[PDB]
Amino acid sequence: TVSSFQVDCFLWHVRKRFADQELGDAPFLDRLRADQASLRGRGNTLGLDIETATRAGKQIVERILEGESDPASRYLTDMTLEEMSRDWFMLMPKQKVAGSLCIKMDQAIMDKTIILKANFSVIFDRLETLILLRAFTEEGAIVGEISPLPSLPGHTGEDVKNAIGVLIGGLEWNDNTVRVTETIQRFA
Numbered sequence: 001t002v003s004s005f006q007v008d009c010f011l012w013h014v015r016k017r018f019a020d021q022e023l024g025d026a027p028f029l030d031r032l033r034a035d036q037a038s039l040r041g042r043g044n045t046l047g048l049d050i051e052t053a054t055r056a057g058k059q060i061v062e063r064i065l066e067g068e069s070d071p072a073s074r075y076l077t078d079m080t081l082e083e084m085s086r087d088w089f090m091l092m093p094k095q096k097v098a099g100s101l102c103i104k105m106d107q108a109i110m111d112k113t114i115i116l117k118a119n120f121s122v123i124f125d126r127l128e129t130l131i132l133l134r135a136f137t138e139e140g141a142i143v144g145e146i147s148p149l150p151s152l153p154g155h156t157g158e159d160v161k162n163a164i165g166v167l168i169g170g171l172e173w174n175d176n177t178v179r180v181t182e183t184i185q186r187f188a
Contacts, residue, residue, distance in 0.1 A: 003060060009039055009050055010057020078117035078181050084132050088142035094170065100151040101163045105144040110174035112137050116164065118184050127157040127187045135171065144171060161188050
């Protein structure tokens, strides 16, 4: 709690710069006002004041900045937010957990052409972290999904590659023709 007061007191102190000169923003700069006031207010009930608290913040944060608090990571996307957050359902559900990847497909889908789309991060020429993969019919219905579970392990490119092959596999049983976007093709 005292440590939580020092931690903010330090972080504000560093936030000031961006708006202090540049474009800023009414709400961002309001947050900086409110957060400076919120430090005033919380300081009084705590019997501590912002000068003292920020210095302790240097040490309390710049020691945790180790590691090295950093490998040019980026981000590739086939889907818009709408494609990713759209609701869908399976009439005949089939779902499993494979490591830390959740795989789903409708078993009622047959004789359709289906495309898989993915949003994920990339390093080199290989997949590092999947955000979401979805199977779409030509009519645009979602009939398959591979999503990552929040876990301590996380997943690998390999795990993801296995998941896709399993999902392509399951869908093709019902005589569906399945392909992948170039994104997936090139990186998984």
